Amino acid sequence: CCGPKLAACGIVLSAWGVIMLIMLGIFFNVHSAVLIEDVPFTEKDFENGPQNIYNLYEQVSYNCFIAAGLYLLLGGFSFCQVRLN
Template identity: 45%
Template sequence: MKICGPKLSLCGLIISTWGIIQLILMGIFYYVQSVALSEDIALEGEYNTIEEFYSLAERGYLQTAYNCWIAALFYIFTLVISGHQFYVNSRASSTM
Protein backbone atom coordinates (compact mmCIF):
# COMPACT_ATOMS: atom_id res chain seq x y z
CA MET A 1 0.00 0.00 0.00
CA LYS A 2 1.48 3.26 -1.14
CA ILE A 3 1.18 6.08 1.41
CA CYS A 4 3.86 8.56 0.35
CA GLY A 5 6.01 9.24 -2.69
CA PRO A 6 9.62 8.31 -3.36
CA LYS A 7 11.12 11.66 -2.31
CA LEU A 8 9.26 11.77 1.01
CA SER A 9 10.13 8.16 1.80
CA LEU A 10 13.81 8.84 1.06
CA CYS A 11 13.69 11.94 3.25
CA GLY A 12 12.11 9.85 6.02
CA LEU A 13 14.89 7.28 5.70
CA ILE A 14 17.62 9.91 5.98
CA ILE A 15 16.07 11.82 8.88
CA SER A 16 15.22 8.63 10.77
CA THR A 17 18.75 7.29 10.40
CA TRP A 18 20.25 10.54 11.68
CA GLY A 19 17.72 10.72 14.53
CA ILE A 20 18.53 7.17 15.66
CA ILE A 21 22.27 7.83 15.66
CA GLN A 22 21.96 11.15 17.47
CA LEU A 23 19.52 9.98 20.14
CA ILE A 24 21.43 6.79 20.91
CA LEU A 25 24.64 8.80 21.34
CA MET A 26 22.88 11.40 23.48
CA GLY A 27 21.39 8.62 25.61
CA ILE A 28 24.85 7.17 26.14
CA PHE A 29 26.26 10.56 27.12
CA TYR A 30 23.41 11.14 29.57
CA TYR A 31 23.89 7.64 30.97
CA VAL A 32 27.57 8.32 31.71
CA GLN A 33 26.53 11.69 33.21
CA SER A 34 28.35 14.02 30.86
CA VAL A 35 28.90 17.39 32.49
CA ALA A 36 28.34 19.18 29.17
CA LEU A 37 24.68 18.10 29.28
CA SER A 38 24.05 19.06 32.92
CA GLU A 39 21.99 22.11 31.97
CA ASP A 40 19.44 19.91 30.21
CA ILE A 41 18.40 17.79 33.19
CA ALA A 42 15.58 18.87 35.47
CA LEU A 43 17.19 20.25 38.64
CA GLU A 44 15.08 22.81 40.42
CA GLY A 45 14.74 24.05 43.96
CA GLU A 46 17.00 24.04 46.95
CA TYR A 47 18.87 21.08 48.37
CA ASN A 48 19.64 20.45 52.02
CA THR A 49 22.66 18.24 51.48
CA ILE A 50 25.09 17.58 48.67
CA GLU A 51 24.04 13.91 48.69
CA GLU A 52 20.45 14.95 47.96
CA PHE A 53 21.66 17.04 45.02
CA TYR A 54 23.79 14.19 43.64
CA SER A 55 20.91 11.75 44.01
CA LEU A 56 18.50 13.99 42.12
CA ALA A 57 21.13 14.74 39.46
CA GLU A 58 21.79 11.01 38.91
CA ARG A 59 18.06 10.35 38.65
CA GLY A 60 17.68 13.21 36.16
CA TYR A 61 20.54 11.95 34.00
CA LEU A 62 19.12 8.41 33.98
CA GLN A 63 15.59 9.54 33.16
CA THR A 64 16.82 11.73 30.31
CA ALA A 65 18.91 8.84 28.94
CA TYR A 66 15.84 6.60 28.95
CA ASN A 67 13.82 9.32 27.21
CA CYS A 68 16.45 9.56 24.46
CA TRP A 69 16.43 5.81 23.94
CA ILE A 70 12.64 5.71 23.80
CA ALA A 71 12.65 8.48 21.19
CA ALA A 72 15.24 6.46 19.21
CA LEU A 73 12.79 3.54 19.22
CA PHE A 74 10.15 5.80 17.69
CA TYR A 75 12.65 6.78 15.01
CA ILE A 76 13.29 3.09 14.32
CA PHE A 77 9.55 2.69 13.75
CA THR A 78 9.63 5.66 11.36
CA LEU A 79 12.66 4.16 9.60
CA VAL A 80 10.80 0.89 9.03
CA ILE A 81 7.74 2.68 7.63
CA SER A 82 9.89 4.90 5.38
CA GLY A 83 11.94 1.93 4.22
CA HIS A 84 8.79 0.03 3.33
CA GLN A 85 7.45 3.00 1.40
CA PHE A 86 10.77 3.44 -0.42
CA TYR A 87 10.66 -0.24 -1.39
CA VAL A 88 7.05 0.00 -2.59
CA ASN A 89 7.82 3.12 -4.63
CA SER A 90 10.97 1.67 -6.21
CA ARG A 91 9.13 -1.55 -7.06
CA ALA A 92 6.22 0.37 -8.60
CA SER A 93 8.54 2.51 -10.74
CA SER A 94 10.54 -0.50 -12.01
CA THR A 95 7.41 -2.31 -13.25
CA MET A 96 6.27 0.59 -15.40
Template identity: 65%
Template sequence: MRGLICGPKLAACGIVLSTWGVIMLAMLGIFFSTHSAVLLEDVPVTDDSIHQDGNPDRIYNLYNKVGYNCFIAAAIYVLFGAFSCCQMKLNKQKEYLVH
Protein backbone atom coordinates in the same frame (compact mmCIF):
# COMPACT_ATOMS: atom_id res chain seq x y z
CA MET B 1 -1.15 0.21 -4.74
CA ARG B 2 -2.40 -0.69 -1.27
CA GLY B 3 -0.58 0.80 1.70
CA LEU B 4 1.22 3.49 -0.26
CA ILE B 5 1.00 6.71 1.74
CA CYS B 6 3.89 8.89 0.58
CA GLY B 7 5.97 9.33 -2.51
CA PRO B 8 9.58 8.32 -3.09
CA LYS B 9 11.09 11.70 -2.20
CA LEU B 10 9.22 11.92 1.10
CA ALA B 11 10.17 8.33 1.92
CA ALA B 12 13.83 9.09 1.21
CA CYS B 13 13.63 12.19 3.38
CA GLY B 14 12.08 10.09 6.16
CA ILE B 15 14.94 7.59 5.94
CA VAL B 16 17.57 10.36 6.19
CA LEU B 17 15.83 12.11 9.08
CA SER B 18 15.25 8.90 11.00
CA THR B 19 18.86 7.82 10.55
CA TRP B 20 20.08 11.14 11.91
CA GLY B 21 17.54 11.02 14.75
CA VAL B 22 18.60 7.53 15.82
CA ILE B 23 22.30 8.44 15.81
CA MET B 24 21.81 11.72 17.67
CA LEU B 25 19.37 10.42 20.28
CA ALA B 26 21.35 7.23 20.92
CA MET B 27 24.47 9.30 21.56
CA LEU B 28 22.55 11.66 23.83
CA GLY B 29 21.11 8.68 25.69
CA ILE B 30 24.59 7.28 26.21
CA PHE B 31 25.95 10.61 27.41
CA PHE B 32 23.03 11.15 29.79
CA SER B 33 23.39 7.61 31.13
CA THR B 34 27.07 8.21 31.86
CA HIS B 35 26.13 11.44 33.72
CA SER B 36 28.02 13.83 31.49
CA ALA B 37 28.62 17.11 33.32
CA VAL B 38 28.23 19.10 30.10
CA LEU B 39 24.54 18.11 29.91
CA LEU B 40 23.67 19.27 33.44
CA GLU B 41 21.76 22.26 32.03
CA ASP B 42 19.47 19.86 30.14
CA VAL B 43 18.47 17.90 33.24
CA PRO B 44 15.13 19.12 34.66
CA VAL B 45 16.37 20.30 38.06
CA THR B 46 16.35 23.67 39.80
CA ASP B 47 19.48 25.32 41.14
CA ASP B 48 18.19 25.13 44.71
CA SER B 49 17.64 21.38 44.65
CA ILE B 50 21.15 20.68 43.30
CA HIS B 51 22.75 21.74 46.58
CA GLN B 52 19.87 20.80 48.86
CA ASP B 53 21.27 17.75 50.65
CA GLY B 54 24.59 17.09 48.89
CA ASN B 55 23.41 13.68 47.66
CA PRO B 56 24.20 13.24 43.94
CA ASP B 57 21.93 10.18 43.59
CA ARG B 58 18.88 12.35 42.95
CA ILE B 59 20.66 14.16 40.10
CA TYR B 60 21.94 10.84 38.74
CA ASN B 61 18.38 9.48 38.72
CA LEU B 62 17.28 12.51 36.69
CA TYR B 63 20.17 11.92 34.28
CA ASN B 64 19.07 8.29 33.89
CA LYS B 65 15.44 9.29 33.27
CA VAL B 66 16.44 11.73 30.54
CA GLY B 67 18.77 9.13 28.99
CA TYR B 68 15.96 6.57 29.05
CA ASN B 69 13.66 9.06 27.31
CA CYS B 70 16.32 9.59 24.64
CA PHE B 71 16.50 5.84 24.02
CA ILE B 72 12.70 5.67 23.72
CA ALA B 73 12.73 8.51 21.19
CA ALA B 74 15.50 6.73 19.25
CA ALA B 75 13.33 3.60 19.12
CA ILE B 76 10.44 5.65 17.76
CA TYR B 77 12.78 6.99 15.07
CA VAL B 78 13.74 3.39 14.21
CA LEU B 79 10.05 2.60 13.68
CA PHE B 80 9.65 5.72 11.54
CA GLY B 81 12.69 4.68 9.49
CA ALA B 82 11.25 1.18 8.99
CA PHE B 83 7.98 2.75 7.83
CA SER B 84 9.90 4.96 5.38
CA CYS B 85 11.81 1.93 4.04
CA CYS B 86 8.52 0.10 3.48
CA GLN B 87 7.16 3.12 1.65
CA MET B 88 10.28 3.24 -0.51
CA LYS B 89 9.86 -0.45 -1.33
CA LEU B 90 6.19 0.06 -2.25
CA ASN B 91 7.15 2.96 -4.49
CA LYS B 92 9.71 0.79 -6.25
CA GLN B 93 7.08 -1.94 -6.77
CA LYS B 94 4.64 0.61 -8.15
CA GLU B 95 7.28 1.93 -10.54
CA TYR B 96 8.07 -1.62 -11.67
CA LEU B 97 4.40 -2.47 -12.28
CA VAL B 98 3.79 0.69 -14.33
CA HIS B 99 6.64 0.03 -16.73
Protein backbone atom coordinates in the same frame (compact mmCIF):
# COMPACT_ATOMS: atom_id res chain seq x y z
CA CYS C 1 2.31 6.26 0.70
CA CYS C 2 4.65 8.61 2.62
CA GLY C 3 5.50 10.55 -0.55
CA PRO C 4 8.45 8.43 -1.79
CA LYS C 5 10.89 11.29 -2.55
CA LEU C 6 10.19 12.98 0.78
CA ALA C 7 10.14 9.44 2.21
CA ALA C 8 13.79 8.89 1.28
CA CYS C 9 14.54 12.35 2.64
CA GLY C 10 12.80 11.18 5.81
CA ILE C 11 14.85 7.98 5.82
CA VAL C 12 18.05 10.03 5.91
CA LEU C 13 16.72 12.61 8.38
CA SER C 14 15.26 10.00 10.76
CA ALA C 15 18.36 7.80 10.65
CA TRP C 16 20.37 10.90 11.58
CA GLY C 17 17.89 11.66 14.35
CA VAL C 18 18.11 8.09 15.67
CA ILE C 19 21.91 8.07 15.70
CA MET C 20 22.13 11.47 17.39
CA LEU C 21 19.44 10.33 19.83
CA ILE C 22 21.14 7.11 20.90
CA MET C 23 24.42 9.01 21.19
CA LEU C 24 22.89 11.75 23.36
CA GLY C 25 21.13 9.19 25.51
CA ILE C 26 24.42 7.35 25.94
CA PHE C 27 26.25 10.45 27.16
CA PHE C 28 23.27 11.17 29.42
CA ASN C 29 23.56 7.65 30.85
CA VAL C 30 27.24 8.36 31.48
CA HIS C 31 26.40 11.42 33.66
CA SER C 32 29.94 11.43 35.02
CA ALA C 33 29.61 14.37 37.45
CA VAL C 34 29.55 16.74 34.48
CA LEU C 35 26.20 18.21 33.42
CA ILE C 36 24.87 19.55 36.72
CA GLU C 37 23.93 22.69 34.75
CA ASP C 38 21.00 20.82 33.13
CA VAL C 39 19.06 19.85 36.29
CA PRO C 40 16.19 22.22 37.31
CA PHE C 41 16.42 22.35 41.11
CA THR C 42 17.13 24.91 43.84
CA GLU C 43 18.31 23.80 47.31
CA LYS C 44 16.68 20.35 46.84
CA ASP C 45 19.44 17.94 45.74
CA PHE C 46 22.33 20.17 46.86
CA GLU C 47 22.01 18.50 50.30
CA ASN C 48 22.93 15.11 51.77
CA GLY C 49 25.57 14.37 49.13
CA PRO C 50 24.92 13.15 45.58
CA GLN C 51 21.32 11.87 45.72
CA ASN C 52 18.60 11.90 43.06
CA ILE C 53 21.00 13.37 40.48
CA TYR C 54 21.90 10.65 37.96
CA ASN C 55 18.22 9.63 37.82
CA LEU C 56 17.22 12.68 35.77
CA TYR C 57 19.95 11.97 33.23
CA GLU C 58 18.82 8.34 33.13
CA GLN C 59 15.20 9.33 32.43
CA VAL C 60 16.33 11.80 29.76
CA SER C 61 18.35 8.99 28.18
CA TYR C 62 15.28 6.74 28.22
CA ASN C 63 13.24 9.50 26.58
CA CYS C 64 15.93 9.80 23.90
CA PHE C 65 15.84 6.03 23.38
CA ILE C 66 12.04 6.07 23.05
CA ALA C 67 12.22 8.91 20.53
CA ALA C 68 14.80 6.90 18.61
CA GLY C 69 12.49 3.89 18.75
CA LEU C 70 9.65 5.90 17.24
CA TYR C 71 11.88 7.28 14.50
CA LEU C 72 13.11 3.72 13.92
CA LEU C 73 9.54 2.47 13.58
CA LEU C 74 9.10 5.17 10.94
CA GLY C 75 12.35 4.05 9.31
CA GLY C 76 11.18 0.45 9.36
CA PHE C 77 7.97 1.40 7.60
CA SER C 78 10.20 3.33 5.20
CA PHE C 79 12.14 0.12 4.57
CA CYS C 80 8.76 -1.51 3.91
CA GLN C 81 7.91 1.20 1.39
CA VAL C 82 11.36 0.75 -0.20
CA ARG C 83 10.60 -2.94 -0.61
CA LEU C 84 7.17 -1.94 -1.96
CA ASN C 85 8.87 0.05 -4.74
